Enzyme design. Structure first.
Site, mmCIF file in Angstrom:
data_model
loop_
_atom_site.group_PDB
_atom_site.id
_atom_site.type_symbol
_atom_site.label_atom_id
_atom_site.label_comp_id
_atom_site.label_asym_id
_atom_site.label_seq_id
_atom_site.Cartn_x
_atom_site.Cartn_y
_atom_site.Cartn_z
ATOM 1 N N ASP A 8 25.032 7.229 -7.956
ATOM 2 C CA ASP A 8 23.761 7.581 -7.372
ATOM 3 C C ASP A 8 23.056 6.265 -7.211
ATOM 4 O O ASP A 8 22.719 5.622 -8.202
ATOM 5 C CB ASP A 8 23.032 8.522 -8.312
ATOM 6 C CG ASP A 8 21.545 8.740 -7.967
ATOM 7 O OD1 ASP A 8 21.007 8.324 -6.896
ATOM 8 O OD2 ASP A 8 20.930 9.365 -8.847
ATOM 9 N N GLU A 173 22.745 13.581 -1.483
ATOM 10 C CA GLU A 173 22.260 13.778 -2.881
ATOM 11 C C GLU A 173 22.125 15.267 -3.272
ATOM 12 O O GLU A 173 22.556 15.681 -4.373
ATOM 13 C CB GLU A 173 20.938 12.965 -3.169
ATOM 14 C CG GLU A 173 21.186 11.416 -3.213
ATOM 15 C CD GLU A 173 19.945 10.546 -2.961
ATOM 16 O OE1 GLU A 173 18.805 11.059 -3.065
ATOM 17 O OE2 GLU A 173 20.117 9.354 -2.638
ATOM 18 N N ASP A 197 13.907 17.950 -5.784
ATOM 19 C CA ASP A 197 14.292 16.612 -6.279
ATOM 20 C C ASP A 197 13.031 15.755 -6.313
ATOM 21 O O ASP A 197 12.635 15.156 -5.321
ATOM 22 C CB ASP A 197 15.309 15.950 -5.348
ATOM 23 C CG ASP A 197 15.873 14.622 -5.900
ATOM 24 O OD1 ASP A 197 15.209 13.886 -6.701
ATOM 25 O OD2 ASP A 197 17.027 14.322 -5.508
HETATM 26 MG MG LIG Z 1 17.290 10.539 -6.838
#
Ligand SMILES: [Mg+2]
EC number: 3.6.4.10
Length: 382
Positions: A8, A173, A197
């Site tokens: 990530d 994501e 998120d």
């Molecule tokens: Mg993030």
């Protein structure tokens, strides 16, 4: 083949994971930290990456680079670049249409494409994985926001290749976060998934459809300038006001003082997810005066109440653009440290008229977790 990892590459913080033998390990760095700031600093003598870089920011603001993800795949002339530039302490200059960060490093002027800065962050993540695995790491899945265009994805891919990585795939994501929770393995009718998120600098709502295990992005929404750091800010201002009332002194123009307060507020905010009060203990904060105080969960929620409630507005817009009632959502997935905030969970659970949230995976780690799962699939190891 080799051991493949999930990375990530976050706006504020990056995280790396490996899927080995039916189990994801999120990998702690050398400092025991499972996430690493997406910071690169340049000094008289060395180039610093991650925690070491973020720790000397107050002392070296003009050569300490962050938010490189806000620039990646964009052109200098892009309006987004132009607004953002107005809030960074380092220079961004134009090199034939493309933005570069300019710094001083070992007494010389040096400039870097945003992909070169993110390559340095990716290098660190790879090292992190290699320190844990005791083996060379080359293969990786790197994640990107669902709204990233072709150019932003390519540049992200290019950051991986500059780092010596073989990027197996660039994946979204919120898709990564769904994979983490095995939502694409729930066989049945088409599933509508909402990903809420709330990260350190950005807020993203995504609505995905999963038909026969295939992902489609139906909707994206949010605010590219709302994150956990906005809440931290309001605590900082709250405590600066409190020091001024107490000591009749304004600490605001002492950069190190404000930095040290901010770090304490970041720690306090995390503590408040688990406990109803948090203490601040700072030795000699300003002009030799110590600052020992505390804040309750309630006070923290009150300071941020408009920001918390307003997160529901992009939720409503994502639903609209996906053409769905809230009742049509099968899975809600929490990503970002701030989704640990009980008030936020409560707000979102009440919005979805009581529906249970996918929240068991550390929301700081859920993106990397999914990316690692997917890395393993692509390399034949799952
Ligand atoms: Mg993030």
């Amino acid at each position: 083949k080799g051991p493949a990892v999930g990375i990530d590459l976050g706006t504020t913080y990056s995280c790396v994971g490996v899927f080995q033998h039916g189990k994801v390990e999120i990998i702690a760095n050398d400092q025991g930290n499972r996430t690493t700031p997406s910071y690169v600093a340049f000094t008289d003598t060395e180039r610093l990456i991650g925690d070491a870089a973020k720790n000397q920011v107050a002392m070296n603001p003009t050569n300490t680079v962050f938010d490189a993800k806000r620039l990646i795949g964009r052109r200098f002339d892009d309006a987004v670049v132009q607004s953002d530039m107005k809030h960074w302490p380092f220079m961004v200059v134009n090199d034939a249409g493309r933005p570069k960060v300019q710094v001083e490093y070992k007494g010389e002027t040096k400039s870097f494409y945003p992909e070169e800065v993110s390559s340095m962050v990716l290098t660190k993540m790879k090292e992190i994985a290699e320190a844990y695995l005791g083996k060379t790491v080359t293969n990786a899945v790197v994640t990107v926001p669902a709204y990233f265009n072709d150019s932003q994805r390519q540049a992200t891919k290019d950051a991986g290749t500059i780092a010596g990585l073989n990027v197996l795939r660039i994946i979204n994501e919120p898709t990564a976060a769904a994979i983490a929770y095995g939502l694409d393995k729930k066989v049945g009718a088409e599933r509508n998934v909402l990903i809420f998120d709330l990260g350190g600098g950005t807020f993203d709502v995504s609505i995905l459809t999963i038909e026969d295990g295939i992902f489609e992005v139906k909707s994206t929404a949010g605010d590219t300038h709302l994150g956990g750091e906005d809440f931290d800010n309001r605590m900082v201002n709250h405590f600066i006001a409190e020091f001024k009332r107490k000591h009749k002194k304004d600490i605001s123009e002492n950069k190190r003082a404000v930095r040290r307060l901010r770090t304490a507020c970041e720690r306090a905010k995390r503590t408040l997810s688990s406990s109803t009060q948090a203490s601040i203990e700072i030795d000699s904060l300003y002009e030799g005066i110590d600052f020992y105080t505390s804040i309750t969960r309630a006070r923290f929620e009150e300071l941020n109440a408009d920001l918390f409630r307003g997160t529901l507005d992009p939720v409503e817009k994502a639903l609209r653009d996906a053409k769905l009632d809230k009742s049509q959502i099968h899975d809600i997935v929490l990503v970002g440290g701030s989704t640990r905030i009980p008030k936020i969970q409560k707000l979102l659970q009440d919005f979805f008229n009581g529906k249970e949230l996918n929240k068991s995976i550390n929301p700081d780690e859920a993106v990397a977790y999914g990316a690692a799962v997917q890395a393993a699939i692509l390399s034949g190891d799952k």
